[PDB]
Amino acid sequence: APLQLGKCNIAGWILGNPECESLKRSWSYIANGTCYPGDFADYEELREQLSSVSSFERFEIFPKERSWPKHNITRGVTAACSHAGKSSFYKNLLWLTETNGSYPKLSKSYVNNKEKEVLVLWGVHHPSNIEDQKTLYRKENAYVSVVSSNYNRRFTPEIAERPKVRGQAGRMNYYWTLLEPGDTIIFEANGNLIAPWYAFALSR
Numbered sequence: 001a002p003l004q005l006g007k008c009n010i011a012g013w014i015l016g017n018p019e020c021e022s023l024k025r026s027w028s029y030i031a032n033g034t035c036y037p038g039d040f041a042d043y044e045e046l047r048e049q050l051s052s053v054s055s056f057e058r059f060e061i062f063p064k065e066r067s068w069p070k071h072n073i074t075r076g077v078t079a080a081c082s083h084a085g086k087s088s089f090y091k092n093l094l095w096l097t098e099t100n101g102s103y104p105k106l107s108k109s110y111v112n113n114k115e116k117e118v119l120v121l122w123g124v125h126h127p128s129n130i131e132d133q134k135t136l137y138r139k140e141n142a143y144v145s146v147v148s149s150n151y152n153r154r155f156t157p158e159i160a161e162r163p164k165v166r167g168q169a170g171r172m173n174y175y176w177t178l179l180e181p182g183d184t185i186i187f188e189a190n191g192n193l194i195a196p197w198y199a200f201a202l203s204r
Contacts, residue, residue, distance in 0.1 A: 003027040016091030018083035035081035037165040038172035061199035072099040092198040112179040123194030128169035142191025
């Protein structure tokens, strides 16, 4: 039987758009997208990845309140993702910002210790201007590094004046990779990382 996303699409569901329900289960096919504007890398491949699963589990990959002691985990909400008439954010990601005047370099790793695949999603924030970049990340030049046994990318914030989309001039790109059992993913960044908070374990 199909997975019913109702008002949402796969992007809004899998990122955790606050308007979208967060779920083990299975389905044969899949029947509010990104509340923050941006590009979703490999989106159609992800739709196909998720099209039929035999067990699916949402799990807290990086516990929000215990993982990021040198960064701010609470101001990272936006009117673009509002909920209960208040600013909010994707339920599966975490918008890290500076604390105490600094955004130190972070380094965070996860090993898939399960006996099935793990789907990890993250984002990179692209401010519209350099003043907002400095306000949030305390430096004009930042990087996000994501490495696993078969994935290696370094992301550079693209700062540029852009049309307002859903009220926002900034953007947020979304990315993902899969981890087989025993594979390790490492996040390194000194700004702009929208960190994993919940990830997914699934089987084909």
